[PDB]
With several copies, the nearest count.
Chain A
């Protein structure tokens, strides 16, 4: 009955993305830890800004519009442009599948 709680991470998805961008390259454990930290940091930044945006304008819901505005506020120029493009494409594809 004494079983430790499980701990989730982004290792699987980071490895998938790595195998897309560089088919031959591998990654060390420490570098994977760095990538998990990075993903958590960015998630928190974007989610916090979206929360503040919703509160300022007296809305109860976080929608993709708040996410887009937060992305535009937090990322520098070309990064923001490309990230917005990727987000809009993903949402459009998701909605197109009913």
Chain B
């Protein structure tokens, strides 16, 4: 018949402590305070929201229900973060 959806809860904790450590290591960070992780998650969330909002706007303008890679590329470009390798 119809394929219904389900809601999602508390997935920000999926960005784990080891992942944030690795991201800092690629950034050249040697020693990390314990209160960084929470901070980092907040930062990430904000970033994501903004991009996703813009992307969804693009998707709604074309009257599509699917967010494509080009929507993300345009959303990032209009925030001063151009991305190569996904089109455009």
Contact (Cβ within 8 A) A37 B61 = no
Which of B57, B82, B85 is the one whose CB lies under 8 Å from A73? B57
Q: How far is the CB of B49 from chain A (nearest CB, A)?
A: 12
Which of A33, A65, A72 is the one whose CB lies under 8 Å from B85? A33
Q: List 11 A-B contacts (CB under 8 A).
A: A33-B86, A33-B87, A37-B83, A41-B82, A49-B78, A53-B61, A56-B74, A57-B62, A66-B61, A69-B61, A73-B54
Q: Report B-chain residues with C-beta under 8 Å of the C-beta of A34.
A: 84-85
Q: Report A-chain residues with C-beta under 8 Å of the C-beta of B83.
A: 37
In the bound complex, CA of A12 to CA of B86 (Å): 19
Q: How far is the CB of A13 from chain B (nearest CB, A)?
A: 17
In the bound complex, CA of A57 to CA of B58 (Å): 10
The reply on B14 being an interface residue by CB < 8 A is no
Interface range on chain B (Cβ under 8 Å from partner)? 10 to 19
Contact (Cβ within 8 A) A30 B61 = no
Contact (Cβ within 8 A) B84 A65 = no
The reply on B88 being an interface residue by CB < 8 A is yes
Taking CB atoms and an 8 Å cut-off, the chain B residues in 54-88 that contact chain A are 54, 57-58, 60-62, 70, 74, 78, 82-88
In the bound complex, CA of A92 to CA of B45 (Å): 38
A37-B87 CB under 8 A given contacts A69-B57, A72-B57:
yes
Contact (Cβ within 8 A) B88 A40 = yes
Leading 4 A-B pairs by shortest Cβ distance: A37-B88, A37-B84, A69-B61, A34-B84
Contact (Cβ within 8 A) A38 B78 = no
The reply on A11 being an interface residue by CB < 8 A is no
Q: How far is the CB of A69 from chain B (nearest CB, A)?
A: 5
